[PDB]
PDB file of all heavy atoms in Angstrom:
ATOM      1  N   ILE X 253     -43.994-103.641   2.990  1.00  0.00           N
ATOM      2  CA  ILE X 253     -42.675-103.870   3.687  1.00  0.00           C
ATOM      3  C   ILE X 253     -42.950-104.603   5.002  1.00  0.00           C
ATOM      4  O   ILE X 253     -42.127-105.447   5.369  1.00  0.00           O
ATOM      5  CB  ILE X 253     -41.941-102.518   3.865  1.00  0.00           C
ATOM      6  CG1 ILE X 253     -41.356-102.024   2.521  1.00  0.00           C
ATOM      7  CG2 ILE X 253     -40.895-102.600   4.952  1.00  0.00           C
ATOM      8  CD1 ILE X 253     -40.873-100.583   2.512  1.00  0.00           C
ATOM      9  N   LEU X 254     -44.027-104.341   5.733  1.00  0.00           N
ATOM     10  CA  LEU X 254     -44.375-104.953   7.007  1.00  0.00           C
ATOM     11  C   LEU X 254     -44.996-106.355   6.818  1.00  0.00           C
ATOM     12  O   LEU X 254     -45.084-107.123   7.779  1.00  0.00           O
ATOM     13  CB  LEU X 254     -45.345-104.045   7.797  1.00  0.00           C
ATOM     14  CG  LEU X 254     -44.693-102.747   8.304  1.00  0.00           C
ATOM     15  CD1 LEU X 254     -45.731-101.666   8.604  1.00  0.00           C
ATOM     16  CD2 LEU X 254     -43.862-103.018   9.556  1.00  0.00           C
ATOM     17  N   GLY X 255     -45.341-106.758   5.576  1.00  0.00           N
ATOM     18  CA  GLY X 255     -45.903-108.082   5.228  1.00  0.00           C
ATOM     19  C   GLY X 255     -45.271-109.227   6.031  1.00  0.00           C
ATOM     20  O   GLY X 255     -45.937-109.884   6.830  1.00  0.00           O
ATOM     21  N   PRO X 256     -43.952-109.517   5.881  1.00  0.00           N
ATOM     22  CA  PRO X 256     -43.307-110.568   6.649  1.00  0.00           C
ATOM     23  C   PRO X 256     -43.504-110.509   8.158  1.00  0.00           C
ATOM     24  O   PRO X 256     -43.745-111.528   8.786  1.00  0.00           O
ATOM     25  CB  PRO X 256     -41.831-110.434   6.281  1.00  0.00           C
ATOM     26  CG  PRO X 256     -41.857-109.835   4.883  1.00  0.00           C
ATOM     27  CD  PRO X 256     -43.091-108.954   4.821  1.00  0.00           C
ATOM     28  N   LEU X 257     -43.451-109.346   8.786  1.00  0.00           N
ATOM     29  CA  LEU X 257     -43.632-109.254  10.291  1.00  0.00           C
ATOM     30  C   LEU X 257     -45.102-109.575  10.597  1.00  0.00           C
ATOM     31  O   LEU X 257     -45.353-110.268  11.600  1.00  0.00           O
ATOM     32  CB  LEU X 257     -43.186-107.893  10.754  1.00  0.00           C
ATOM     33  CG  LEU X 257     -41.682-107.616  10.776  1.00  0.00           C
ATOM     34  CD1 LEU X 257     -41.397-106.142  10.994  1.00  0.00           C
ATOM     35  CD2 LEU X 257     -40.963-108.421  11.838  1.00  0.00           C
ATOM     36  N   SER X 258     -46.052-109.064   9.779  1.00  0.00           N
ATOM     37  CA  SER X 258     -47.521-109.449   9.821  1.00  0.00           C
ATOM     38  C   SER X 258     -47.652-110.959   9.824  1.00  0.00           C
ATOM     39  O   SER X 258     -48.349-111.509  10.713  1.00  0.00           O
ATOM     40  CB  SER X 258     -48.190-108.805   8.640  1.00  0.00           C
ATOM     41  OG  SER X 258     -49.614-108.967   8.708  1.00  0.00           O
ATOM     42  N   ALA X 259     -47.023-111.642   8.859  1.00  0.00           N
ATOM     43  CA  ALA X 259     -47.104-113.119   8.663  1.00  0.00           C
ATOM     44  C   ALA X 259     -46.555-113.823   9.904  1.00  0.00           C
ATOM     45  O   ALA X 259     -47.261-114.690  10.427  1.00  0.00           O
ATOM     46  CB  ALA X 259     -46.303-113.492   7.421  1.00  0.00           C
ATOM     47  N   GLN X 260     -45.374-113.461  10.375  1.00  0.00           N
ATOM     48  CA  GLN X 260     -44.739-114.103  11.546  1.00  0.00           C
ATOM     49  C   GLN X 260     -45.611-113.954  12.816  1.00  0.00           C
ATOM     50  O   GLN X 260     -45.582-114.865  13.623  1.00  0.00           O
ATOM     51  CB  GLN X 260     -43.347-113.505  11.762  1.00  0.00           C
ATOM     52  CG  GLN X 260     -42.659-114.030  13.007  1.00  0.00           C
ATOM     53  CD  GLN X 260     -41.213-113.564  13.098  1.00  0.00           C
ATOM     54  OE1 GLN X 260     -40.661-113.129  12.099  1.00  0.00           O
ATOM     55  NE2 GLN X 260     -40.669-113.616  14.284  1.00  0.00           N
ATOM     56  N   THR X 261     -46.316-112.868  13.010  1.00  0.00           N
ATOM     57  CA  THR X 261     -47.049-112.628  14.278  1.00  0.00           C
ATOM     58  C   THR X 261     -48.551-112.964  14.120  1.00  0.00           C
ATOM     59  O   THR X 261     -49.220-113.041  15.136  1.00  0.00           O
ATOM     60  CB  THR X 261     -46.864-111.192  14.816  1.00  0.00           C
ATOM     61  OG1 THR X 261     -47.538-110.355  13.891  1.00  0.00           O
ATOM     62  CG2 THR X 261     -45.425-110.820  14.944  1.00  0.00           C
ATOM     63  N   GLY X 262     -49.026-113.163  12.894  1.00  0.00           N
ATOM     64  CA  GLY X 262     -50.461-113.303  12.582  1.00  0.00           C
ATOM     65  C   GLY X 262     -51.289-112.063  12.934  1.00  0.00           C
ATOM     66  O   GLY X 262     -52.521-112.215  13.005  1.00  0.00           O
ATOM     67  N   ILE X 263     -50.693-110.897  13.101  1.00  0.00           N
ATOM     68  CA  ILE X 263     -51.447-109.612  13.279  1.00  0.00           C
ATOM     69  C   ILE X 263     -51.342-108.794  12.014  1.00  0.00           C
ATOM     70  O   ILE X 263     -50.172-108.440  11.653  1.00  0.00           O
ATOM     71  CB  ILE X 263     -50.934-108.830  14.519  1.00  0.00           C
ATOM     72  CG1 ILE X 263     -50.905-109.705  15.774  1.00  0.00           C
ATOM     73  CG2 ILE X 263     -51.778-107.585  14.687  1.00  0.00           C
ATOM     74  CD1 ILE X 263     -50.172-109.097  16.959  1.00  0.00           C
ATOM     75  N   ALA X 264     -52.456-108.511  11.324  1.00  0.00           N
ATOM     76  CA  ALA X 264     -52.509-107.724  10.061  1.00  0.00           C
ATOM     77  C   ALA X 264     -51.922-106.331  10.309  1.00  0.00           C
ATOM     78  O   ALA X 264     -52.072-105.809  11.463  1.00  0.00           O
ATOM     79  CB  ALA X 264     -53.918-107.616   9.526  1.00  0.00           C
ATOM     80  N   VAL X 265     -51.383-105.702   9.271  1.00  0.00           N
ATOM     81  CA  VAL X 265     -50.725-104.383   9.394  1.00  0.00           C
ATOM     82  C   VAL X 265     -51.755-103.353   9.827  1.00  0.00           C
ATOM     83  O   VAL X 265     -51.492-102.596  10.767  1.00  0.00           O
ATOM     84  CB  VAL X 265     -50.050-104.016   8.057  1.00  0.00           C
ATOM     85  CG1 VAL X 265     -49.562-102.582   8.077  1.00  0.00           C
ATOM     86  CG2 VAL X 265     -48.906-104.998   7.782  1.00  0.00           C
ATOM     87  N   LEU X 266     -52.956-103.373   9.233  1.00  0.00           N
ATOM     88  CA  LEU X 266     -54.035-102.443   9.642  1.00  0.00           C
ATOM     89  C   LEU X 266     -54.599-102.765  11.031  1.00  0.00           C
ATOM     90  O   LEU X 266     -55.047-101.798  11.632  1.00  0.00           O
ATOM     91  CB  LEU X 266     -55.094-102.434   8.560  1.00  0.00           C
ATOM     92  CG  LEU X 266     -54.634-101.783   7.260  1.00  0.00           C
ATOM     93  CD1 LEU X 266     -55.692-101.888   6.188  1.00  0.00           C
ATOM     94  CD2 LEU X 266     -54.234-100.342   7.529  1.00  0.00           C
ATOM     95  N   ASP X 267     -54.496-103.995  11.568  1.00  0.00           N
ATOM     96  CA  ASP X 267     -54.866-104.219  12.988  1.00  0.00           C
ATOM     97  C   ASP X 267     -53.811-103.520  13.876  1.00  0.00           C
ATOM     98  O   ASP X 267     -54.201-102.830  14.809  1.00  0.00           O
ATOM     99  CB  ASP X 267     -55.079-105.689  13.370  1.00  0.00           C
ATOM    100  CG  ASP X 267     -56.230-106.380  12.659  1.00  0.00           C
ATOM    101  OD1 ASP X 267     -56.939-105.734  11.895  1.00  0.00           O
ATOM    102  OD2 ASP X 267     -56.367-107.606  12.877  1.00  0.00           O
ATOM    103  N   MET X 268     -52.540-103.702  13.568  1.00  0.00           N
ATOM    104  CA  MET X 268     -51.432-103.034  14.306  1.00  0.00           C
ATOM    105  C   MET X 268     -51.556-101.493  14.185  1.00  0.00           C
ATOM    106  O   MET X 268     -51.357-100.817  15.216  1.00  0.00           O
ATOM    107  CB  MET X 268     -50.078-103.510  13.806  1.00  0.00           C
ATOM    108  CG  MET X 268     -48.937-103.066  14.739  1.00  0.00           C
ATOM    109  SD  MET X 268     -49.046-103.789  16.397  1.00  0.00           S
ATOM    110  CE  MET X 268     -48.446-105.447  16.035  1.00  0.00           C
ATOM    111  N   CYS X 269     -51.975-100.946  13.041  1.00  0.00           N
ATOM    112  CA  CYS X 269     -52.290 -99.515  12.887  1.00  0.00           C
ATOM    113  C   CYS X 269     -53.329 -99.065  13.901  1.00  0.00           C
ATOM    114  O   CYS X 269     -53.184 -97.923  14.431  1.00  0.00           O
ATOM    115  CB  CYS X 269     -52.685 -99.143  11.480  1.00  0.00           C
ATOM    116  SG  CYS X 269     -51.277 -99.258  10.317  1.00  0.00           S
ATOM    117  N   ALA X 270     -54.362 -99.884  14.141  1.00  0.00           N
ATOM    118  CA  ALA X 270     -55.411 -99.611  15.151  1.00  0.00           C
ATOM    119  C   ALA X 270     -54.781 -99.582  16.566  1.00  0.00           C
ATOM    120  O   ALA X 270     -55.167 -98.714  17.338  1.00  0.00           O
ATOM    121  CB  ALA X 270     -56.542-100.601  15.087  1.00  0.00           C
ATOM    122  N   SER X 271     -53.864-100.481  16.864  1.00  0.00           N
ATOM    123  CA  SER X 271     -53.135-100.484  18.155  1.00  0.00           C
ATOM    124  C   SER X 271     -52.349 -99.170  18.309  1.00  0.00           C
ATOM    125  O   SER X 271     -52.495 -98.519  19.367  1.00  0.00           O
ATOM    126  CB  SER X 271     -52.224-101.680  18.260  1.00  0.00           C
ATOM    127  OG  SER X 271     -51.728-101.767  19.591  1.00  0.00           O
ATOM    128  N   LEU X 272     -51.630 -98.745  17.278  1.00  0.00           N
ATOM    129  CA  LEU X 272     -50.863 -97.477  17.291  1.00  0.00           C
ATOM    130  C   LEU X 272     -51.817 -96.284  17.539  1.00  0.00           C
ATOM    131  O   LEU X 272     -51.470 -95.405  18.333  1.00  0.00           O
ATOM    132  CB  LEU X 272     -50.086 -97.324  15.988  1.00  0.00           C
ATOM    133  CG  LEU X 272     -49.236 -96.047  15.898  1.00  0.00           C
ATOM    134  CD1 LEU X 272     -48.433 -95.807  17.170  1.00  0.00           C
ATOM    135  CD2 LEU X 272     -48.306 -96.108  14.689  1.00  0.00           C
ATOM    136  N   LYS X 273     -52.970 -96.253  16.856  1.00  0.00           N
ATOM    137  CA  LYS X 273     -53.973 -95.122  17.054  1.00  0.00           C
ATOM    138  C   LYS X 273     -54.323 -95.036  18.530  1.00  0.00           C
ATOM    139  O   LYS X 273     -54.388 -93.873  19.067  1.00  0.00           O
ATOM    140  CB  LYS X 273     -55.250 -95.350  16.239  1.00  0.00           C
ATOM    141  CG  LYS X 273     -55.078 -94.956  14.774  1.00  0.00           C
ATOM    142  CD  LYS X 273     -56.097 -95.608  13.868  1.00  0.00           C
ATOM    143  CE  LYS X 273     -57.496 -94.994  13.952  1.00  0.00           C
ATOM    144  NZ  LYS X 273     -58.340 -95.549  12.863  1.00  0.00           N
ATOM    145  N   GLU X 274     -54.607 -96.152  19.177  1.00  0.00           N
ATOM    146  CA  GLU X 274     -54.977 -96.238  20.617  1.00  0.00           C
ATOM    147  C   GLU X 274     -53.839 -95.763  21.493  1.00  0.00           C
ATOM    148  O   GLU X 274     -54.141 -94.985  22.408  1.00  0.00           O
ATOM    149  CB  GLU X 274     -55.420 -97.655  20.989  1.00  0.00           C
ATOM    150  CG  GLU X 274     -55.833 -97.757  22.440  1.00  0.00           C
ATOM    151  CD  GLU X 274     -56.715 -98.965  22.714  1.00  0.00           C
ATOM    152  OE1 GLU X 274     -57.903 -98.995  22.225  1.00  0.00           O
ATOM    153  OE2 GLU X 274     -56.210 -99.889  23.346  1.00  0.00           O
ATOM    154  N   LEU X 275     -52.610 -96.209  21.264  1.00  0.00           N
ATOM    155  CA  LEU X 275     -51.428 -95.822  22.088  1.00  0.00           C
ATOM    156  C   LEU X 275     -51.266 -94.302  21.996  1.00  0.00           C
ATOM    157  O   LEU X 275     -50.875 -93.730  23.008  1.00  0.00           O
ATOM    158  CB  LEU X 275     -50.185 -96.485  21.549  1.00  0.00           C
ATOM    159  CG  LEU X 275     -50.033 -97.981  21.923  1.00  0.00           C
ATOM    160  CD1 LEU X 275     -49.043 -98.696  21.035  1.00  0.00           C
ATOM    161  CD2 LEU X 275     -49.625 -98.110  23.374  1.00  0.00           C
ATOM    162  N   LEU X 276     -51.479 -93.695  20.827  1.00  0.00           N
ATOM    163  CA  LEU X 276     -51.299 -92.243  20.582  1.00  0.00           C
ATOM    164  C   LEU X 276     -52.353 -91.521  21.403  1.00  0.00           C
ATOM    165  O   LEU X 276     -52.024 -90.440  21.945  1.00  0.00           O
ATOM    166  CB  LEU X 276     -51.418 -91.936  19.087  1.00  0.00           C
ATOM    167  CG  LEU X 276     -50.162 -92.303  18.266  1.00  0.00           C
ATOM    168  CD1 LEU X 276     -50.404 -92.203  16.766  1.00  0.00           C
ATOM    169  CD2 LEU X 276     -49.014 -91.392  18.649  1.00  0.00           C
ATOM    170  N   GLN X 277     -53.553 -92.092  21.510  1.00  0.00           N
ATOM    171  CA  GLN X 277     -54.690 -91.502  22.284  1.00  0.00           C
ATOM    172  C   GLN X 277     -54.503 -91.639  23.800  1.00  0.00           C
ATOM    173  O   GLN X 277     -54.879 -90.709  24.535  1.00  0.00           O
ATOM    174  CB  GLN X 277     -55.957 -92.229  21.819  1.00  0.00           C
ATOM    175  CG  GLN X 277     -57.155 -92.046  22.708  1.00  0.00           C
ATOM    176  CD  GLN X 277     -58.235 -92.962  22.209  1.00  0.00           C
ATOM    177  OE1 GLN X 277     -58.900 -92.655  21.211  1.00  0.00           O
ATOM    178  NE2 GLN X 277     -58.389 -94.151  22.849  1.00  0.00           N
ATOM    179  N   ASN X 278     -53.988 -92.776  24.279  1.00  0.00           N
ATOM    180  CA  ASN X 278     -54.011 -93.125  25.739  1.00  0.00           C
ATOM    181  C   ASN X 278     -52.662 -92.883  26.392  1.00  0.00           C
ATOM    182  O   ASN X 278     -52.614 -92.710  27.627  1.00  0.00           O
ATOM    183  CB  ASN X 278     -54.429 -94.596  25.936  1.00  0.00           C
ATOM    184  CG  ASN X 278     -55.833 -94.950  25.442  1.00  0.00           C
ATOM    185  OD1 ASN X 278     -56.627 -94.051  25.177  1.00  0.00           O
ATOM    186  ND2 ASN X 278     -56.100 -96.235  25.325  1.00  0.00           N
ATOM    187  N   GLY X 279     -51.538 -92.993  25.630  1.00  0.00           N
ATOM    188  CA  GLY X 279     -50.199 -93.120  26.191  1.00  0.00           C
ATOM    189  C   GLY X 279     -50.042 -94.534  26.779  1.00  0.00           C
ATOM    190  O   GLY X 279     -50.786 -95.419  26.378  1.00  0.00           O
ATOM    191  N   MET X 280     -49.102 -94.719  27.693  1.00  0.00           N
ATOM    192  CA  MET X 280     -48.651 -96.071  28.104  1.00  0.00           C
ATOM    193  C   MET X 280     -49.127 -96.438  29.515  1.00  0.00           C
ATOM    194  O   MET X 280     -49.074 -97.627  29.840  1.00  0.00           O
ATOM    195  CB  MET X 280     -47.131 -96.168  28.009  1.00  0.00           C
ATOM    196  CG  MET X 280     -46.692 -96.176  26.577  1.00  0.00           C
ATOM    197  SD  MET X 280     -45.040 -96.771  26.419  1.00  0.00           S
ATOM    198  CE  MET X 280     -45.087 -97.346  24.759  1.00  0.00           C
ATOM    199  N   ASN X 281     -49.633 -95.452  30.275  1.00  0.00           N
ATOM    200  CA  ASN X 281     -50.207 -95.705  31.613  1.00  0.00           C
ATOM    201  C   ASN X 281     -49.164 -96.455  32.433  1.00  0.00           C
ATOM    202  O   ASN X 281     -49.385 -97.672  32.705  1.00  0.00           O
ATOM    203  CB  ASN X 281     -51.541 -96.470  31.459  1.00  0.00           C
ATOM    204  CG  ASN X 281     -52.329 -96.612  32.756  1.00  0.00           C
ATOM    205  OD1 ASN X 281     -51.908 -96.107  33.798  1.00  0.00           O
ATOM    206  ND2 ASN X 281     -53.443 -97.298  32.696  1.00  0.00           N
ATOM    207  N   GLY X 282     -48.014 -95.818  32.691  1.00  0.00           N
ATOM    208  CA  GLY X 282     -46.937 -96.338  33.526  1.00  0.00           C
ATOM    209  C   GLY X 282     -46.356 -97.660  33.053  1.00  0.00           C
ATOM    210  O   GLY X 282     -45.622 -98.287  33.803  1.00  0.00           O
ATOM    211  N   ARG X 283     -46.688 -98.125  31.827  1.00  0.00           N
ATOM    212  CA  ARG X 283     -46.036 -99.333  31.286  1.00  0.00           C
ATOM    213  C   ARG X 283     -44.910 -98.895  30.345  1.00  0.00           C
ATOM    214  O   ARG X 283     -44.674 -97.671  30.212  1.00  0.00           O
ATOM    215  CB  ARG X 283     -47.044-100.247  30.582  1.00  0.00           C
ATOM    216  CG  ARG X 283     -47.891-101.080  31.563  1.00  0.00           C
ATOM    217  CD  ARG X 283     -49.110-101.693  30.913  1.00  0.00           C
ATOM    218  NE  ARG X 283     -49.974-100.649  30.421  1.00  0.00           N
ATOM    219  CZ  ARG X 283     -51.280-100.768  30.156  1.00  0.00           C
ATOM    220  NH1 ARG X 283     -51.899-101.940  30.358  1.00  0.00           N
ATOM    221  NH2 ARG X 283     -51.967 -99.731  29.693  1.00  0.00           N
ATOM    222  N   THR X 284     -44.180 -99.858  29.790  1.00  0.00           N
ATOM    223  CA  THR X 284     -43.067 -99.643  28.843  1.00  0.00           C
ATOM    224  C   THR X 284     -43.234-100.686  27.737  1.00  0.00           C
ATOM    225  O   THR X 284     -43.926-101.685  28.013  1.00  0.00           O
ATOM    226  CB  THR X 284     -41.704 -99.775  29.553  1.00  0.00           C
ATOM    227  OG1 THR X 284     -41.436-101.124  29.905  1.00  0.00           O
ATOM    228  CG2 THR X 284     -41.587 -98.904  30.784  1.00  0.00           C
ATOM    229  N   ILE X 285     -42.714-100.415  26.570  1.00  0.00           N
ATOM    230  CA  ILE X 285     -42.556-101.427  25.459  1.00  0.00           C
ATOM    231  C   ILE X 285     -41.052-101.585  25.189  1.00  0.00           C
ATOM    232  O   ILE X 285     -40.358-100.555  25.114  1.00  0.00           O
ATOM    233  CB  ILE X 285     -43.406-101.027  24.245  1.00  0.00           C
ATOM    234  CG1 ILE X 285     -44.877-100.824  24.665  1.00  0.00           C
ATOM    235  CG2 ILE X 285     -43.295-102.077  23.137  1.00  0.00           C
ATOM    236  CD1 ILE X 285     -45.789-100.412  23.516  1.00  0.00           C
ATOM    237  N   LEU X 286     -40.609-102.825  25.077  1.00  0.00           N
ATOM    238  CA  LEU X 286     -39.181-103.214  24.881  1.00  0.00           C
ATOM    239  C   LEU X 286     -38.244-102.257  25.645  1.00  0.00           C
ATOM    240  O   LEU X 286     -37.201-101.868  25.094  1.00  0.00           O
ATOM    241  CB  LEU X 286     -38.908-103.215  23.342  1.00  0.00           C
ATOM    242  CG  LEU X 286     -39.649-104.306  22.584  1.00  0.00           C
ATOM    243  CD1 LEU X 286     -39.630-103.998  21.117  1.00  0.00           C
ATOM    244  CD2 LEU X 286     -39.029-105.685  22.813  1.00  0.00           C
TER     245      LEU X 286
END
Side-chain angles (χ1 to χ4, degrees):
Chain X
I253 285 166
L254 290 160
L257 288 167
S258 188
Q260 176 173 342
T261 68
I263 308 169
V265 170
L266 290 176
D267 297 357
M268 193 63 77
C269 289
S271 190
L272 180 47
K273 280 158 76 172
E274 180 160 290
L275 283 162
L276 283 169
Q277 165 187 282
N278 298 345
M280 289 196 155
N281 188 2
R283 282 165 300 201
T284 71
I285 306 179
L286 292 164

